């Protein structure tokens, strides 16, 4: 009865966790904090440039699947 | 300079600069203040508007 021909249950959570999140907008500011790394998520324009070394390119994310370079692996 | 058959009246308006005094009694208005929002939009090729 637990045939489970679909592979959906308990696998597709891991794929939806990657394919889910939208780019952030409308983040709120508190005067007490006034400057946080969560702000810097939106502040960074997240550039595409070369340091000519392999690990630095892995960091910068030029070896991106999309057209626009995405760092973070 | 002969007087015509009629007489005449003139109406004018004037504007006066005034430094003003405002008085308000204690605790007359209750204000509700919300969390401020910061949003980003319409990125130019060399700029982004917030």
Curated annotation (Swiss-Prot), chain A:
The keyword NADP does not apply. Transmembrane segments: none annotated. Keywords: Capsid protein, Host nucleus, Virion. It is found in: Virion; Host nucleus. Signal peptide: none annotated. One of its GO terms (cellular component) is host cell nucleus. One of its GO terms (molecular function) is DNA binding. This is Triplex capsid protein 1. The chain holds residues 1 to 73 of 364 of the full protein.
UniProtKB/Swiss-Prot annotation, chain B:
It is found in: Virion; Host nucleus. Self-assembles to form an icosahedral capsid with a T=16 symmetry, about 200 nm in diameter, and consisting of 150 hexons and 12 pentons (total of 162 capsomers). Hexons form the edges and faces of the capsid and are each composed of six MCP molecules. In contrast, one penton is found at each of the 12 vertices. Eleven of the pentons are MCP pentamers, while the last vertex is occupied by the portal complex. Homomultimer. Makes the hexons and eleven out of twelve pentons. Interacts with triplex proteins 1/TRX1 and 2/TRX2; adjacent capsomers are linked together in groups of three by triplexes, heterotrimeric complexes composed of one molecule of TRX1 and two molecules of TRX2. Interacts with scaffold protein; this interaction allows efficient MCP transport to the host nucleus. Interacts with capsid vertex component 2/CVC2. Interacts with the small capsomere-interacting protein/SCP. Belongs to the herpesviridae major capsid protein family. This is Major capsid protein. It comes from Epstein-Barr virus (strain B95-8). The chain holds residues 1037 to 1086 of 1381 of the full protein.
């Amino acid at each position: 009865m637990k045939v489970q021909g679909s592979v959906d249950r308990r696998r597709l959570q891991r794929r939806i966790a990657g394919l889910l999140p939208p780019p952030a907008r409308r983040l709120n500011i508190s005067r007490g904090s006034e400057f946080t790394r969560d702000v810097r998520g939106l502040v960074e324009e997240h550039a595409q440039a070369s340091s000519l070394s392999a690990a630095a390119v892995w960091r910068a994310g030029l070896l991106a699947p999309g057209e626009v370079a995405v760092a973070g692996g | 300079k002969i007087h015509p058959g009629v007489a005449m009246t003139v109406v004018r308006t004037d504007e006066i600069l005034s430094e003003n005094i405002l008085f308000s009694s204690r605790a007359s208005t209750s204000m509700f203040i919300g969390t401020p929002n910061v949003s980003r939009r319409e990125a130019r090729v060399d700029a982004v508007t917030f």
